C-alpha cells in the first residue's frame, strides 16, 4: 500500500490511453456502499466525461457517475440511470458523496456537503464483487474500449468507498477532513496501476 495523502493524480492532456486502474480486495457481493471523492476540471463547458467507472464482467456499467453536458450529474447502477440536474456550472474543485442501499433503493447525493433529494433505484438488485475500477476512462468493455470523447482531463483524489451507508454526520466529518476508516478502498492504503500520461503532484484543493 502507498499513502496518497495530500497528493493527487494529474491527467494533463485529453487522450484515450492515459488511465489509472484500481484494485479492490472485495470478496462478498455488495448490497450497499458509499462513494466519496474530490475532483476538479474545467471540461464542464464542453463534452461529457466519466468520474468513476465500476464494471463487472457481465455489465460495463455496474456503477458509473458521469457528468452529462448541460444536464448535470448522472448516476447509474445496474444499467439504470438517474440524473441530478445542475442549473449553472461554476469553476472550482468539488467534493461529492453518494450512497445507495439495496434494501430500500434509496440514493443519497451530497454535492459540496449540500444534500440532494433522495430518490429510488433498482430495489432488490445486487452488485458483484469481482470488478475493474478505472479512473480517467469510461469503459464500455471489461478492460478497454475507452472512447476519446469521454476521457477526463483534470484532477481527482480522496477517492474512497465503503460497503454500507454512512449517516449524515459521518458525511459531514468526511467533507471537513476528519479521521475515518474506509473498508473497500482506502486513499491512505491505496493500491493502483497507472497507464499513460498521468502524474502525481500535491493537491490544489484545500
Amino acid at each position: 500500500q502507498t499513502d496518497m495523502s495530500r497528493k493527487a493524480f494529474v491527467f494533463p492532456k485529453e487522450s484515450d490511453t492515459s488511465y489509472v486502474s484500481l484494485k479492490a480486495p472485495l470478496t462478498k457481493p455488495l448490497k450497499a456502499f458509499t462513494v466519496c471523492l474530490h475532483f476538479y476540471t474545467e471540461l464542464s463547458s464542453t463534452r461529457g466525461y466519466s468520474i468513476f467507472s465500476y464494471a463487472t464482467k457481465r455489465q460495463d456499467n455496474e456503477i458509473l457517475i458521469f457528468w452529462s453536458k448541460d444536464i448535470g450529474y448522472s448516476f447509474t447502477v445496474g444499467g439504470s440511470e438517474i440524473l441530478f440536474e445542475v442549473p449553472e456550472v461554476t469553476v472550482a474543485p468539488v467534493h461529492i458523496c453518494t450512497s445507495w442501499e439495496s434494501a430500500s433503493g434509496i440514493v443519497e447525493f451530497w454535492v459540496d456537503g449540500k444534500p440532494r433529494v433522495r430518490k429510488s433505484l433498482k430495489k432488490g438488485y445486487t452488485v458483484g464483487a469481482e470488478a475493474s475500477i478505472i479512473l480517467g476512462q469510461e469503459q464500455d468493455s471489461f478492460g478497454g474500449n475507452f472512447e476519446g470523447s469521454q476521457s477526463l482531463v483534470g484532477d481527482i483524489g480522496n477517492v474512497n468507498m465503503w460497503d454500507f451507508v454512512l449517516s449524515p454526520d459521518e458525511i459531514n466529518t468526511i467533507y471537513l477532513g476528519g479521521p475515518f476508516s474506509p473498508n473497500v478502498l482506502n486513499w491512505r492504503a491505496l493500491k493502483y496501476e497507472v497507464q499513460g500520461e498521468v502524474f502525481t503532484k500535491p493537491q490544489l484543493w484545500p
Partner: nanobody, 125 residues
Framework: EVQLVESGGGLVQTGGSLRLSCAAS????????MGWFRQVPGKEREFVAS????????DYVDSAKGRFTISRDNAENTVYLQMNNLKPEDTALYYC???????????????????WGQGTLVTVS
C-alpha cells in the same frame, strides 16, 4: 411535448443497411428518452430498442443486439437507428416514440410511452 418525425425508410435487398433517423420538435428533447418500435399489419406495435437521455445507457431486443445500433445527438436532438444484415421478416412499419420528460431507467412496455410519430416503412426483398 416534442413532435416526432422519421425518415430513412424504403426497400432494400437482404444483407443491406439502413440508417433510419428521427427528428424531434421541442426544447426538452434532452429530457426525454427515445425508443424505436415495430408494427405489422394484423398485429400491434412491438418494442425494438431505446436510448438514454444523457446517451450513455441503451437497451436492445434479443434479435436486434449485435445487428442494430442506437444513438442520439443531443445538440442536433436527433435519434439514429442503424440496422444491418436485414432479413425479409424485418419488413414493417417503424415508429420513433419517446416520453419521459423526467428521469428513470429504460423500460420495455408501451403504456409509459406517450408521444408517437407518423412512422416509416421498411422492406426487405
Amino acid at each position: 411535448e416534442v413532435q416526432l418525425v422519421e425518415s430513412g425508410g424504403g426497400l432494400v435487398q437482404t444483407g443491406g443497411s439502413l440508417r433510419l433517423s428521427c427528428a424531434a420538435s421541442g426544447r426538452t428533447f434532452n429530457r426525454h428518452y427515445m425508443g424505436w418500435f415495430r408494427q405489422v399489419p394484423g398485429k400491434e406495435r412491438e418494442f425494438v430498442a431505446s436510448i438514454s437521455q444523457t446517451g450513455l445507457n441503451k437497451d436492445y431486443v434479443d434479435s436486434a443486439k449485435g445487428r442494430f445500433t442506437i444513438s442520439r445527438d443531443n445538440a442536433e436532438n436527433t435519434v439514429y437507428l442503424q440496422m444491418n444484415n436485414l432479413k425479409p421478416e424485418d419488413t414493417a412499419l417503424y415508429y420513433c416514440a419517446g416520453s419521459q420528460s423526467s428521469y428513470y431507467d429504460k423500460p420495455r412496455l408501451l403504456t409509459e410511452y406517450a408521444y408517437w410519430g407518423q412512422g416509416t416503412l421498411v422492406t426487405v426483398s
